[PDB]
Amino acid sequence: SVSKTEHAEINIFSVASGHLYERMLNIMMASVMHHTNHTVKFWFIEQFLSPSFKDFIPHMAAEYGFKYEMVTYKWPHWLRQQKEKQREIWGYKILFLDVLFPLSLDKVIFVDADQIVRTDMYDLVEHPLDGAPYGFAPMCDSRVEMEGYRFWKTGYWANYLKGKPYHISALYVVDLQRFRELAAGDRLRQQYHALSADPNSLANLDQDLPNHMQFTIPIATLPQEWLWCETWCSDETLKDARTIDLCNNPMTKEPKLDRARRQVPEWTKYDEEIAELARRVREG
């Protein structure tokens, strides 16, 4: 309750790089606030954001009734760098969970910038982790026609996992008290540093690292309904989805905004609402 009183009942962080992902990030935030009456604070990885986004966030905060904070954490010099901006952004999602946030914050949830929330996120804050420092949803198996693209069901990953789930990194709850209690941050940084000496390792950096460490840094497998993506999940399970991720479909390669408008009926409503707020602020 000290964390809830000082920060908020729900604390969410995200990362966005590019005007398209910033546009989706405002939509994600509006979707969270339309589905909760609990207090919310959004945390941003500051250095990737545009000046316009950072100028607009106080307007979003006053319109939607949320608190916010910008975190600017410098990549430690000892730790192997990522030349590709995509991989550096993935590093910011998983390698610094213990240092991005204050010691007074007990829990934080990563929600992808391209996500659409359809649930009260305080349900994830209250979800029992049974001692795990973090919880991730598994990758769906329900869309049977995409089995050939489930790389984790054969080869390296099938042997490595021994039947454990291969989790998606679009959404994850981190019990920061337990993550700190376990030294998970230091351990994830040292494993990443050693593994990344091979440039063929950790292809999906943010996702592969926690899945690789799940025998020593436990993952609480969240209910499947916490994360639904069309690529892997059946149409039939969309009605149960608490959140939607617009993940890439390797079979169709359909553009991001087309996936958003086609799959999510309320997407244009949030987009037009944020554009209406922008026009209202611009005149004044």
Ligand X SMILES: O=c1ccn([C@@H]2O[C@H](COP(=O)(O)OP(=O)(O)O)[C@@H](O)[C@H]2O)c(=O)[nH]1
Ligand Y SMILES: *[C@@H]1O[C@H](CO)[C@@H](O)[C@H](O)[C@H]1NC(C)=O
Q: Which of residues 106-135 bind ligand X (CB under 6 A)?
A: 113-114
| Cα–Cα nearest to 117, from 66, 45, 48 | 66
| Cβ 251 vs Cβ 207: under 8 Å | no
In the bound state with ligand X, the residue whose beta carbon lies nearer, of 171 and 213, is 171
In the bound state with ligand X, the residue whose beta carbon lies nearer, of 22 and 175, is 22
Q: Does 18 bind ligand X (CB under 6 A)?
A: yes
In the bound state with ligand X, the residue whose beta carbon lies nearer, of 16 and 222, is 16
SS3 letters across 206-227: HHHHHHHCCCCCCEEECCHHHC
Q: Is 33 helix (H, G, I), strand (E, B) or coil?
A: helix
In the bound state with ligand Y, the residue whose beta carbon lies nearer, of 32 and 170, is 32
| Cβ 229 vs Cβ 149: under 8 Å | no
Q: Which of 112, 175, 206, 208 binds Ca ion (CB under 5 A)?
A: 112
Shortest approach of ligand Y to residue 35 CB, angstroms? 5
Q: Does 22 bind Ca ion (CB under 5 A)?
A: no
Q: What is the DSSP secondary structure assignment for residue 76, as one 8-state letter?
A: P
Site string for ligand Y, 27-46 (x = CB under 6 A): --------xxx---------
Is 175 annotated in some ligand binding site? no
Q: Does 206 bind Ca ion (CB under 5 A)?
A: no
Exposed (0-12), middle (13-18) or buried (19+): which is 239, by Cβ within 10 Å? Answer: exposed
Q: Does 97 bind ligand X (CB under 6 A)?
A: no
Distance CA 32, CA 36 (A): 7
Q: Which of 63, 69, 88, 120 binds ligand Y (CB under 6 A)?
A: 120
37 binds, among ligand X, ligand Y, Ca ion, none (CB under 5 to 8 A by kind): ligand Y
Q: Where are the alpha helices (DSSP H) in the chain?
A: 2-6, 19-33, 51-64, 85-94, 122-125, 155-161, 176-182, 184-195, 205-212, 256-263, 267-283
Instruction: Note the residues at the interface with ligand Y (CB under 6 A).
Output: 35-37, 120
Instruction: Note the residues at the interface with ligand X (CB under 6 A).
Output: 16-18, 21, 86, 89, 113-114, 246-248
